[PDB]
Amino acid sequence: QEIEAKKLNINSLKEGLKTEKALLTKELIEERETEIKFQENEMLDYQQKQFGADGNL
Amino acid sequence: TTRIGYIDMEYILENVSDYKEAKSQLELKAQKWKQEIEAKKLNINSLKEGLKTEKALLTKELIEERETEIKFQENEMLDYQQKQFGADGNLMRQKAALAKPIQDQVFTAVQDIAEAKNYDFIFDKSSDLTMLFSNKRFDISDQVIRILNRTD
Amino acid sequence: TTRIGYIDMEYILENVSDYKEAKSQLELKAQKWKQEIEAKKLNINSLKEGLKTEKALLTKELIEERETEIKFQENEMLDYQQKQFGADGNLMRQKAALAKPIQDQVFTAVQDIAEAKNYDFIFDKSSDLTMLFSNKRFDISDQVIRILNRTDKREQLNKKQLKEQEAKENREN
Amino acid sequence: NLYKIYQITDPAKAEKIKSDITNNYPGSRYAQILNNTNTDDIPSPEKEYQKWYKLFQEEKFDVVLDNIDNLINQYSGDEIVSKFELLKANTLGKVNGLEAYKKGLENVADNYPNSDEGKNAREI
């Protein structure tokens, strides 16, 4: 459930970026994409901590 | 009249050599490779989403080349995964190179001990799932360890 | 003290001719399935090339129908491939079912041997790596193979032989 | 279509009609596909749209303004004009603001409701 909440947040961020991908310049798009990538990496770290080969499972 | 002993393969491996540190380093490298595979999967998914977003503006010709590029990336990730984590190669080959000479030496020492002392069965307790209880008196691992240490 | 015997299931399966022949026939069937998959691939590629060659002369509707037909053919090929060679497909299920009668016969023979010779435990040496060193004196695999061959090459006794057997076995009363 | 039908059955009339198409009435695409000459004939998407898309990508919205302004009517008569209108709307939105983008999207939806570009306009 926690991972699903994180996925919902990441999908909301992706949709928010998508709804303005055809309006703003390239620098804002790149910054938002880097933020999305950072969020996805945080999700991957959380998944590896919880369900990973060593820890919390 | 039936003589039974047992060995602990993990205990012998840890005692004779620095197996634990090398195994931990290999595990860290394998985890790094797995994270790289996950990053490649994320990049592929992002490329697929970007292609899906832009389809009307395309001529179906750049769509074809983008699909071929996505397929090439997927195949590259798949072959990288097979090379690193195949049943033979770069993880299994590394683990084999780590633990095979000592395993063969332990097997030879066990056979020599069995022939000399007329053992009937020598069990491997290293699985820890079978062989739940062992008397620890029918334990020949110190002999195996001393035979291994005798060889330089 | 306990008496321990053991078999080697891989060795027994290697020394059964009918099992090897059935495995070879299964491999031949798998090769035929692979050839059928290749034929499906050839048809799919021919359809794709035909669509590509005359893609300019077709309307949007016709292009859509041709693309849907190609996608249907590709999905059918994928379904056939997964059904025949999947992890639980026809090939794997048929491979797993080949040794079941041999396993039944081996189990019965092992029960009978352990009853005859006072064995307390009979292990399958090839099931796992727990058995590191096993003395060959306690390997009953060759006895099981002899039993399996004996039942495979059974022969019905003649009327004279049957009468002699009845007379011999009826001598107790 | 008669050429294809006669190619499947009775190829003599197929060859006759193929020669008729090739020599009497050389089509834009039909003539050079019947004899399989080449892709030399300039297509709508390949021309002034696959490189116009490059201009759109490379952040060059000054020349492409008038380019789309005269190419929206220069290349009328094919489904490409819907993509041209969509590109014009996207450029106008990127250089003017949200209202221009909305006006372009609704104009594209009105002009070509029965197209993939029309569905794109409706969804966005």
UniProtKB/TrEMBL annotation, chain A:
The entry sums up its family as follows: Belongs to the Skp family.
Which regions form coiled coils? 1-49
**Would you say which domain of life the source belongs to?**
Bacteria
Shown portion of the complete protein runs from 58 to 114 of 341
Lineage, top ranks: Bacteria, Pseudomonadati, Bacteroidota, Flavobacteriia, Flavobacteriales
| Species in which this protein is naturally found | Flavobacterium johnsoniae
Instruction: Indicate what this protein is called per its UniProt record.
Output: Periplasmic chaperone for outer membrane proteins Skp
Q: Where are the transmembrane segments?
A: none
TrEMBL record, chain D:
Q: Which residue stretches, if any, does this entry annotate as coiled coil?
A: none
Q: What is this protein called?
A: SprE
Protein's organism: Flavobacterium johnsoniae (strain ATCC 17061 / DSM 2064 / JCM 8514 / BCRC 14874 / CCUG 350202 / NBRC 14942 / NCIMB 11054 / UW101)
Q: What is the lineage of its organism?
A: Bacteria, Pseudomonadati, Bacteroidota, Flavobacteriia, Flavobacteriales
- Gene symbol here is sprE
Full protein segment contained here: 623 to 746 of 870
